[PDB]
Design a protein. Structure first.
Ligand SMILES: Nc1ncnc2c1ncn2[C@@H]1O[C@H](COP(=O)(O)OP(=O)(O)OP(=O)(O)O)[C@@H](O)[C@H]1O
Ligand SMILES: [Mg+2]
Lengths: 209, 287, 55, 94, 51, 30, 111, 191, 57, 287, 191
């Protein structure tokens, strides 16, 4: 009857359920989950759920009606999908770029070498950086070098535009940032590329707007 | 008056047919007719069922097709069942086991022809291997419920079905319709074939796993066992050291070396013992 | 989607105005629009058989 | 005619049987393998023709009876281990 | 074992209960009431439970 | 011997000997 | 109407409704699962949210009227001093979209 | 009267014979046309089926009130092989037994103008089986007025017993199309 | 049954309506992709009681 | 040709049900129906079936009536109900093949160009599946005998849709034993495989008895197959196979020993934790 | 036998045959059926049968009925409650009363009904000093009756419990064995 009861409690994982994010765990059988509807709830979690999968910000499946944590989804749920390197990969090359060898070498040592030599970095005592910002005047080769890096790199590549993270639905955009970073982490080695970061990274913010 | 002991006995074939129609038409509230016989005033066998065309959109019941129904009935009588229509069944994929306004109207239509007609609602989505969500219904009369009467007679203590669900209660249970208890017929002969399901042929019983693949699997699994042994040494060390959060908030989001090590030993030991026994039995029998 | 195409934007300076380093929230939103436009023209994804005219 | 265990043929035996010489039995055996009547290999260092299969041949009533006796022995062995496994695992066995 | 199984069977029943909102207390009133901002919109005054 | 050790440990494990208001509250809130 | 994000188990699809919420939903049988890939518009049922049909990419009413505005019937004969400018605009617009291989031969990507 | 009938039609190699204008095949088609029209003009609940007696001894169309189906199926027929007719009648009787209308009186009408090389002992055995299972048969013979007419008369008499009037025989010598005799036969006369 | 069909149509067409838009008009037989003032996009397999060729995005 | 066929619990239940219907109506000893399914790549999934009125004699082996008009009516109607379930063959509940089966297969082939027969033995069995699948094929004999249509076996097994599995599991909720363990289930599979091998060997032995005594003529294809099998039987005393067997047995026993040691350490850890909890609880109670 | 009702008949037959005897074979059979048999009705019937068999030694029932009451199946719990009631009817057993007190307010309508009815059967013709729970159970019965929270079957149990408590003008006790030690067949049949 224990086996039968487990199979019965499987009933609560019915297909039409709403997705959410597991924020924090309170007890062994309760946790706080932010539902995708915008709000967050402190609710019980199904016992037959591997707690090792309840990583921070992990996407979970909440019951449609009771809104309890009914399942934990694979970390591939995301709105910003990787590029299908079969066709979406750019046609630019470091040969097509020409010049700017200093910038090419800096971008290499920042993004490409540490993705295949991080052991060497740790062994010589360097701390690899995440983020390079490629700043400069317009038309000097920032997005072209990004395209060349995407073409040549043998690592996952997630391109996005800073203006795409702003969505009408409140909570979408932080959800999208979480999704892109989760996808990159689960497809590591990965390179994220945010074009026009100053679309969301501006310094003047007017709360109340 | 009707009794609070009526029992709808759905046969195995009937249940399988409703479930197949359910997880064939979704989300459409697919529908069919239940064939059986009112053996007495307290029992309704549902020997068989048969689906209806489900023309176009079917989010609502579709006004049972008389010509299709008649031709079904005539051919079934020709090739067996000389049984009348004891009710109608339809699917509620994930909703629950209640009745909508259209369902209530259709069940009025069925009662008008046969006062004992039953309305079965299956829930193919919410069904799971061991408990199928299904419920039989008949409608309460507005006339009696306004003129102060209980449209069920409580001779027995069989009104303890499941403490009816809040979904049904808010969707109109105990006010416009009532739930009829459902049982099933066990023949011990169909059950033999239902058990023959999942059965494996003696080829599979005696087959040996590819030895190269078996060795590679053992090598890999022992490698994860090695890593989990390192992590288990780490965890046992910092386990008694502190237990403020060890109770529940020291394994969430982090691997459990003990649990994964138990899983690995279980799986590999099963595989190795089974293959050894298979090899030995084979060496002797195929001599 | 309709590959041979032209996009005419009359009085572009409504959107494509200079970007303010001290602008208001409205200015920042319009600058987000401008930067989406810039990425669409000459961002990561190349544009084929789509031409732009701006008056 | 040779059994399933001692089915190793020597060049001298095949030469005597077929009235050929040990220098042509080798080509004869390769021709047999090529046409597919037999399956096996040749070790010319020891001049032994290892065989593992021959084309199915018609059998007489006595041969069918002998095959039946062999099948009976096989069936007895199978039954013996069925009983052994069942008895030894009776507790766990479902 | 029986307690475990009963816990599972009541779990299936008590997981259909509505999930509870989470709100940040901003100020505690008298007569056992608390001003709470419920995420993400709404500022209510809620009576505290008798536990 | 290892299986014997596991069986002995499992056998040896000693298990020490060991609400309706919520029931009513749930029924009323529903 | 929503858009599919990924397929999970041949009967579970993570689909986000345009309103913004995200769900895992089922799929009615005759949908040719290959036709609905991550990013495709779908029509979820209003009650069970199960996919019913895949839809082509939406065209906003704004973009529709943008495409369909009537530019009168102005001819090049109604423009005066603009002759060099007219031919530069035509160079950029027309010729690259009608004879796109001359520029390929010369070795440029037309403006 | 509720009647469930099947027409067994012999379509042997001999049915390219031209003793009936134009050929026995067309004469048989006309005969089945008129008999099925009579069946339809009778109680419409009456139903009719078609069996072909040849080397395959096949059933073309089972019981069906409609007539166009039977006519088209019989038109799509060619003469080949020899007749068995023992299979024929047995398969026909099985079709009778497996009819949707049990209240329908069982009926087989067989056009069997051909040499029937079946031993009279088995003929009479089959006749006794049919009569004891309560199926009446109205056999129609043409062409061979001597080779098998004695056997058919004996078969019908064996079905008859003493008062089993349901069993009947009608033998027609060669002449014009097999229409006037079938119209002015006791079988359709009693309809 | 014109009378009863119109009766049912009027019962379904009783006020109040929700005012939406006809953002897209697809062909599949014509279908709508309306967007309603609750800011909700609904695909209509059947346009409804108004002529299909009278609605524009 | 179809190498693999998957029958469903609904099909099995409907076949048993049709057999019971005919048995109640009369006495035929066999019932024939039509079988609808899909055509997954080189795999015939038979999802549903419907009875048709079929009759035959017991002597002539040619007197049999099958109502193809009823067949096509019912098939078109089931097509109206569900479209993907096309005619895929027929079934007959005989304990063994029959002479008429070739003719009935031709009649079905008039509908399905590649028809697969499935004999669904309603009589309960113990050492085999209830479905035996055959496909008609022309046999071009090497001994110059005229080519004749013959039935060819195709691997048949029972499989279930999600809803079919849910329903059958609900029906077998109290019969099927699931608290067995993977290792116990695999050992049961091994013993069942030995039983099946013994049954096949006994069938061959009985056939050889019949042939030797004289009831059956010599079948040269069967004799070829038998001697091929007996020659294929391996030798397990070659002094090289023995060395390989011992080497792999030790390579598996090392892994079994490692897993057993890991399990013992885990059990000791569990015992330590249990005793720690016991002492803590007892001391707190004494406090 | 196949029928669950026939199996329940077998359980009741064991109860009647071995009533009072306390036969260990009957206890084994009934308890094994209550444990492992696939029908809840017959499980409950088996527990009640065990209660019937154990009334000559009311000190023994508490153990088994406790194990079956702090238990899994709602029907098993209810059967344990009725087994306790049948066993201790007229005894006012403090242990049985203590066992049934938690059972009241159980998450099942019929379980509460059975617990209340068995409790009243046990305190039949009892008073405060003999067993210091009569007032508690009387006030429990009164509240259950004049409450709307409780289910209809719980109300039925409470009414029956009050009736039992004040049965026979509160001048009658339920004893399955006569005052001289002879099994009281009318009482066994009545219960
Ligand atoms: N170093 C370079 N060598 C060759 N072509 C270059 C170089 N830099 C830019 N280009 C040309 O300029 C265009 C690429 O511009 P790109 O998108 O890289 O600019 P950017 O520096 O990212 O500026 P912005 O953000 O203003 O768009 C292409 O036409 C490319 O041919
Ligand atoms: Mg750029």
């Amino acid at each position: 009857e224990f086996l039968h009861a487990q199979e019965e409690v499987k009933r609560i994982q019915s297909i039409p359920l709403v997705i959410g994010q597991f924020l924090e765990a309170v007890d062994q059988n309760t946790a706080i989950v932010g539902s995708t509807t915008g709000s967050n709830y402190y609710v019980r979690i199904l016992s037959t759920i591997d707690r090792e999968l309840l990583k921070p910000n992990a996407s979970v499946a909440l019951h449609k009606h009771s809104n309890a944590l009914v399942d934990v989804l694979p970390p591939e749920a995301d709105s910003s999908i990787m590029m299908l390197t079969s066709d979406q990969k750019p046609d630019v090359m470091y040969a097509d770029i020409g010049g700017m060898d200093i910038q090419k070498q800096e971008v290499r040592e920042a993004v490409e070498l540490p993705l295949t030599h991080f052991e060497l970095y740790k062994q010589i005592g360097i701390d690899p950086p995440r983020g390079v910002l490629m700043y400069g005047p317009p038309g000097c080769g920032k997005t072209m070098l990004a395209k060349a890096v995407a073409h040549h790199t043998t690592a996952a590549f997630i391109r996005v535009v800073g203006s795409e993270f702003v969505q009408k639905y409140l909570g979408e955009g932080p959800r999208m940032v979480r999704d892109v970073f989760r996808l990159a982490k689960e497809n590591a080695p990965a390179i994220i590329f945010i074009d026009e970061i100053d679309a969301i990274a501006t310094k003047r913010f007017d709360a109340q707007t | 008056a009707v009794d609070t002991a009526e029992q709808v006995y759905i046969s195995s074939l009937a249940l399988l047919k409703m479930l197949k129609h359910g997880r064939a038409g979704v989300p459409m509230e697919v529908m069919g007719l239940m064939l059986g016989e009112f053996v007495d005033d307290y029992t309704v066998r549902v020997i068989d069922v048969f689906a209806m065309p489900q023309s176009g959109t079917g989010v609502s019941v579709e006004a049972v097709d008389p010509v299709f129904q008649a031709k079904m009935l005539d051919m079934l009588k020709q090739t067996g069942r000389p049984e009348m229509v004891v009710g109608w069944y339809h699917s509620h994929p994930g909703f629950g086991c209640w009745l909508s306004g259209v369902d209530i109207n259709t069940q009025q239509s069925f009662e008008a022809l046969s006062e004992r007609a039953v309305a079965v609602v299956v829930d193919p989505i919410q069904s799971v291997k061991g408990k199928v969500v299904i419920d039989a219904f008949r409608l309460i009369n507005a006339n009696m419920m306004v003129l102060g009467h209980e449209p069920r007679q409580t001779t027995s203590n069989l009104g303890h079905l499941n403490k009816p669900s809040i979904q049904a209660l808010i969707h109109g249970l105990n006010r416009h319709y009532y739930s009829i208890t459902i049982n099933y017929r066990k023949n011990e002969l169909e059950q033999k074939m239902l058990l023959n399901l999942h059965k494996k042929s003696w080829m599979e019983g005696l087959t040996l796993q590819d030895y190269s693949e078996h060795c590679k699997h053992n090598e890999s699994v022992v490698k994860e066992m090695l890593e989990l042994a390192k992590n288990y040494n780490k965890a046992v060390e910092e386990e008694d050291k502190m237990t403020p959060e060890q109770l529940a908030i020291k394994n969430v989001g982090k691997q459990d070396p003990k649990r994964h090590l138990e899983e690995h030993v279980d799986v590999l030991m099963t595989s190795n013992i089974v293959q050894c026994l298979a090899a030995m039995l084979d060496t002797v029998v195929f001599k | 989607d309709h590959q041979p195409c032209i996009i005419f934007m009359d009085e572009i300076d409504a959107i494509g105005g200079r970007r303010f380093s001290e602008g208001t929230s409205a200015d920042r939103e319009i600058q987000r629009t401008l930067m989406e436009l810039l990425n669409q023209m000459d961002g990561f994804d190349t544009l084929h058989r789509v031409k732009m005219i701006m008056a | 005619t040779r059994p399933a265990n001692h089915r190793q043929l020597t060049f001298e035996e095949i030469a005597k049987s077929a009235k050929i010489t040990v220098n042509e039995v080798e080509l004869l055996v390769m021709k047999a393998l090529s046409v597919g009547l037999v399956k096996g290999s040749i070790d010319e260092v020891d001049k032994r023709v290892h065989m593992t299969w021959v084309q199915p041949r018609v059998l007489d009533l006595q041969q069918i009876k002998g095959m039946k006796d062999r099948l009976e022995f096989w069936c007895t062995d199978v039954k013996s281990m069925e009983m052994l496994v069942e008895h030894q695992a009776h507790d766990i066995l479902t | 074992l029986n307690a475990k199984v009963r816990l599972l069977r009541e779990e299936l029943q008590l997981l259909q209960e509505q999930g509870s909102y989470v709100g940040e207390v901003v100020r505690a009133m008298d007569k056992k009431k608390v001003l709470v901002k419920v995420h993400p919109e709404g500022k209510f005054v809620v009576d505290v439970d008798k536990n | 011997f290892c299986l014997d050790i596991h069986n002995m440990s499992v056998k040896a494990m000693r298990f020490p000997p060991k609400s309706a208001e919520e029931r009513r509250e749930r029924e009323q809130q529903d | 109407v929503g858009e599919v994000l990924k397929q999970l188990t041949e009967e579970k699809f993570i689909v986000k409704a345009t309103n913004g919420p995200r769900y895992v939903v089922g799929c009615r049988r005759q949908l040719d699962k290959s036709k609905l890939k991550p990013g495709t518009r779908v029509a979820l049922d209003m009650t069970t949210l199960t996919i019913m049909r895949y839809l082509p990419r939406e065209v906003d009413p704004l973009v529709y009227n943008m495409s369909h505005e009537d530019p009168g019937n102005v001819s090049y004969s109604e423009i005066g001093g603009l002759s060099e400018q007219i031919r530069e605009l035509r160079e950029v617009i027309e010729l690259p979209l009608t004879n796109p291989e001359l520029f390929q031969r010369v070795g440029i990507i037309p403006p | 009267v509720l009647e469930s009938t099947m027409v067994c039609v012999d379509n042997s190699e001999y049915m390219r014979n031209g003793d009936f204008l134009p050929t026995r095949l067309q004469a048989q088609q006309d005969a089945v046309n008129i008999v099925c029209h009579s069946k339809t003009r009778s109680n419409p609940e009456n139903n009719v089926g078609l069996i072909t007696l040849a080397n395959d001894c096949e059933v073309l169309t089972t019981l069906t009130p409609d007539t166009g189906r039977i006519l088209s199926k019989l038109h799509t027929v060619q003469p080949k092989g020899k007749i068995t007719f023992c299979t024929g009648i047995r398969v026909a009787h099985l079709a009778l037994k497996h009819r949707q209308g049990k209240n329908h009186k069982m009926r087989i009408i067989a056009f069997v103008g051909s040499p029937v090389e079946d031993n009279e002992k088995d003929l009479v055995k089959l006749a006794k089986r049919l009569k004891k299972e309560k199926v009446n048969v109205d056999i129609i013979n043409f062409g061979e007025e001597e080779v098998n007419t004695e056997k058919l008369t004996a078969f019908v008499n064996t079905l008859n017993g003493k008062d089993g009037t349901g069993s009947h025989l009608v033998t027609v010598p060669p002449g014009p199309s097999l229409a006037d005799a079938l119209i002015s036969s006791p079988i359709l006369a009693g309809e | 049954k014109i009378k009863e069909n119109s009766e049912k149509i009027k019962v379904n067409k009783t006020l109040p309506y929700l005012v939406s838009n006809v953002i897209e008009l697809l062909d599949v037989g014509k279908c709508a992709v309306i967007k309603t003032s609750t800011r909700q996009t609904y695909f209509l397999p059947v346009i409804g009681l108004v002529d299909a060729e009278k609605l524009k995005p | 040709a179809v190498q693999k066929v998957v029958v469903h619990p609904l099909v099995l239940l409907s076949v048993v049900d049709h057999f019971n219907r005919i048995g109640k109506v009369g006495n035929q000893k066999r019932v024939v129906g039509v079988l609808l399914g899909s055509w997954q790549k080189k795999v015939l999934d038979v999802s549903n079936s419907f009875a048709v009125p079929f009759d035959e004699d017991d002597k002539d082996d040619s007197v049999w009536f099958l109502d193809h008009d009823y067949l096509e009516n019912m098939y078109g109607m089931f097509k109206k109900v569900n479209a993907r379930e096309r005619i895929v063959g027929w079934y007959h509940t005989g304990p063994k093949l029959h002479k008429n089966d070739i003719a009935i297969n031709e009649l079905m082939k008039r509908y399905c160009p590649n028809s697969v027969l499935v004999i669904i033995d309603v009589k309960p069995k113990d050492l085999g599946l209830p479905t035996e699948a055959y496909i008609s094929v022309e046999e071009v004999h090497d001994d110059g005998t005229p080519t004749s249509k013959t039935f060819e076996h195709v691997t048949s097994e029972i499989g279930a849709e999600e809803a079919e599995e849910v329903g059958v599991e609900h029906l077998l909720r109290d019969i099927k034993d699931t608290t067995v363990g993977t290792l116990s289930q695999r050992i049961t599979n091994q013993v069942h495989g030995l039983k099946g091998l013994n049954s096949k060997l006994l069938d061959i032995r009985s056939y050889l008895e019949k042939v030797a005594t004289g009831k059956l003529p010599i079948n040269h294809q069967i004799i070829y197959q038998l001697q091929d099998v007996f020659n294929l039987l391996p030798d397990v005393s070659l002094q090289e196979f023995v060395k390989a067997f011992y080497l792999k047995t030790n390579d598996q026993m090392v892994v079994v020993y490692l897993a057993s040691l890991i399990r013992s350490v885990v059990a000791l850890h569990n015992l330590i934790n249990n005793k720690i909890a016991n002492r803590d609880a007892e001391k707190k109670e004494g406090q | 036998d196949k029928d669950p009702i026939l199996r329940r008949s077998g359980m009741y037959t064991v109860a009647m045959a071995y009533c009072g005897s306390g036969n260990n074979k009957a206890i084994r059979r009934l308890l094994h059926v209550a444990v492992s048999d696939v029908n809840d009705d017959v499980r409950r019937a088996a527990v009640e049968s065990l209660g019937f068999i154990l009334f000559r030694t009311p000190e023994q029932c508490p153990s088994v009925v406790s194990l079956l009451s702090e238990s899994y199946n709602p029907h098993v719990r209810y059967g344990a409650a009725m087994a306790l009631g049948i066993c201790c009817a007229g005894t006012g057993n403090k242990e049985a009363i203590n066992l049934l007190e938690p059972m009241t307010n159980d998450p099942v309508n019929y379980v509460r009904q059975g617990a209340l009815i068995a409790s009243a059967l046990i305190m039949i013709q009892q008073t405060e000093i003999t067993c210091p729970k009569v007032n508690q159970f009387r006030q429990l019965y009164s509240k259950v009756i004049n409450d709307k929270h409780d289910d209809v079957m719980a109300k039925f149990g409470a009414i029956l419990a009050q009736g039992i408590l004040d049965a026979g003008g509160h001048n009658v006790t339920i004893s399955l064995q006569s005052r001289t030690g002879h099994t009281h067949m009318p009482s066994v049949v009545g219960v």
